[model samples]
Target: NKSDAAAKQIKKLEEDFDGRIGVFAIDTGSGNTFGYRSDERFPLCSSFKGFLAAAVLERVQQKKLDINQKVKYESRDLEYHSPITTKYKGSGMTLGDMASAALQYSDNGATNIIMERFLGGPEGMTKFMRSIGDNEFRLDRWELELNTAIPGDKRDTSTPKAVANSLNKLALGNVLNAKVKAIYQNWLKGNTTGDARIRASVPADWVVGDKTGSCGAYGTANDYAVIWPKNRAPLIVSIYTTRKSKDDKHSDKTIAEASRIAIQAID
Candidate 1:
């Protein structure tokens, strides 16, 4: 059933993205999965928020940090590509709020703040990502420093396959305590950026959770998400593109196409 659907979908995606792309999907309930160039690393963009979320939750469970505690962010830290971080600049909010904004809105300022205050800075995030099976997930200074693109900052990052592995650990309830997982799940649920690819493929009311990253055309654009289609099964899907593109529409098309193929593979 999904096979035909995927074939039809990928064709549309190829026409949209205008370059090579990769994808991976796994359905837990049905035990169905598939991949294309799933191991090739691409730029992570803002997708690294998921790893940061897990790391923060892990620390919370260890009693090393409290999500309710407020962290002060300077006005300078507030300026970034994301709206949530900019909106909360002067006001002090709880760590949990920052995490929520970071993932749901893909807020760069919120992401940088959490990485600096809670995740032990850049090296801390790196260590945590590696700890949780993201061996290839590397954080460059530019990625850590916000909008300023650095030269050699062109570091290659995650593959669709690796992203799936990370999602597996989180989905299996192995990454954090039940309470922490609940919080992270809430963040995913609150995500409002449904305009991206993964969300475009499914019905409007479907209960899917995901994180997306974009780096313009500098290297690769990405959309990775976990879908729990209504009355169907749960699935983990990742899509990354290495070709140049002028807008988010390219990544959206790629993600929608990959989702169609992935749904077929898993179903």
Candidate 2:
């Protein structure tokens, strides 16, 4: 009866925004589930950085890469919207520093550099995701290009459920080794780009680790997180939105509002 009522509210939200709103939440404590268009596809945008960082940690666990190893880059190596790497260009930063910049600040340059150095490319990321049993999570292109967010293109897209499931594995399950898990968790807990998303929906007392994504087209945006409330195990939630028109502006408040309803669905 809880999610039943929440579905109607979410439907109204979809109509009001004139876009498709997808939400999925799992209450790990009670095994409760909630969904609205959760199986439908939506663009991943920069949210893929979370998975990219996870892949980096996986390689570290395999002894393929060291988190402390420093990597130097020139001006040409920097990518657009790279606040952190840009400042350190020609200087250098550790693999862990670049990964942190990618997840905490969504640094495009850092992500691309880390991906190239460790995971190979977009295909490598998709391979790692499948290695962890997430067949639906795909990254067909590199950053910038992957953010296109075409209305019907399946490239760089994933369902809310797929994202939530993958996140649960990476953030909450044993998919990542012990030390790497702690490292990934710390990076997410300090994410700076998600203030207006899931963090805004949850109570201040609740602890949350999340990542936000915006495609800047077709009103496409998303947020996924793990929330630990007082006296409860934890809940994994994913919300994604897309409108038909490419000119439609993305709304952080709308994602936050959807998160509020999505959390209530499992109450």
Candidate 3:
């Protein structure tokens, strides 16, 4: 009831979606883990926003950036999928609130604003990851272009294991100082888009915080999370998917099913 059994279950799940699936899960307290094609590259999509917020908070902790400083943006700056940031007329939100909207709302414009105004685009985000000793995560290009989700492209991709590691490091580990780590977890817990994904698979009473991404091509989408199960140590799981057919839609059901199998895998 560990790794292989879950792999078999996930293999069956992938067939219905007609896509390749990557999953990696770890129970930190019990030292149990499972992975399926977890090392293969998959698009980072909007999932990078979680780490983006963490990195921004890191900058805040370092005294290099001011989280309270306000950021000003024009109407055209409100790019695709900007449900939260678009409401602002401009000259209002601080860089910290920018991260708030990006994570909780998955606001693409807020993400871009942080990338452009603070993180120095994708390169800066990668630098922060490297500083935390994670070498597998990489973010190239920008918001809409990065979502292209080309089948074999590495422009903006990381393995499922890497995603889980990143989430674990920032959320549960010591990579971010205590204050920023709590801030990161707080934002992720409020994420509105992942209810049907990992949050659906775990028990109702368990506390869960996650970042989700969707690339509307090749059925590409993903979610990574930290799940606190009762009194035990927290669990981390990263689930990602994509298909050969560009016409195929990304499936929340697939992600949720994979999450169920992964959760049971470590129990």
Candidate 4:
């Protein structure tokens, strides 16, 4: 009955949404879950960077890479989607700092540099994802490459369940080592990109570590997070939408509304 009620409420929100929507929510502690088009893949845009962060952190934990190593950028690495390169054009940054920018600021330049320097581009990241048993998600292009003529389905994409599963693994410390997990968690906790989405309706005291993504030209918006409610078990929620008007605020409102209802349902 509880699950049915939650689904009814989510369907009600969907009635007001303007485009294709996918959602996956799970109470990790209680094993309760909900899904709506959750298995359907959609372009994740910048949200896939969260997976990249995980892959990188896993390498760091294995001692195969060092996050503290300084990395320099060249003209070829510059992309306008993120401000990190433009803001620090002539400067070098540590790999960890670049990752922080990638997650917190959604810095395209930093994301490209980190993926190139650490993960050997999307190929390597894809390998990492497969190694971790993520088959539904794929990383095939850089941030700048997203605008090119790649097929919509071939670009970096993920389903809601895939995104939520990734966050769930991280939150449960099932993948990265404890120290590396903390570092990754810190980056997500510092993210300021989704204040108007998942964080918008959540109580201020609730702990939400999240990542947001948008590809206005492609009409995609997404938010994925691990939320810790006061005196309750944590849950993972991933919301995605596409085919809406470009850069429409209503798309974000759809995710926020769904998030509010889901949170209340769990409460």
What are the per-residue Cα lDDT tens digits for candidate 4 across 1-267? 765787787767666665677888888777878787789887777887777778777877888878887777755647786677567667777778877788888889888877777788888977877777788887777776663322355567878888888788875657988888888887888888899899886889988889988876545778998888898888888988776455544377788887876665555
lDDT of 1: 0.71
| lDDT of candidate model 4 versus the reference | 0.77
lDDT of 3: 0.89
Q: Can you rank all candidates by lDDT, best first?
A: 2, 3, 4, 1
Model 2 poorest 10 in a row by lDDT? 71-80
Ranking by TM-score: 2, 3, 4, 1
TM-score list, all predictions? 0.86, 0.98, 0.97, 0.91
List where candidate 1 sits over 4 angstroms from the true fold.
1-12, 75-77, 143-156, 245-249
In angstroms, what RMSD does candidate 4 have relative to the true structure?
2.3
Give candidate 3 misplaced runs (Cα > 4 Å). none
- Tens-place lDDT digits, model 2, residues 146-165: 98899789999999999998
In order, candidate lDDTs are 0.71, 0.90, 0.89, 0.77
Clashes of each: 1, 0, 0, 0
lDDT of 3 by residue, 49-158 (tens): 98999989988998988989988786565687988778774656888888988998889988887888788889998998899888998999998999999987998999
Best by TM-score: 2
- RMSD of each predicted structure: 3.2, 1.0, 1.2, 2.3
Point out the higher-scoring one by TM-score: 1 or 4. Answer: 4
- When 1 and 2 are scored with lDDT, the better candidate is 2
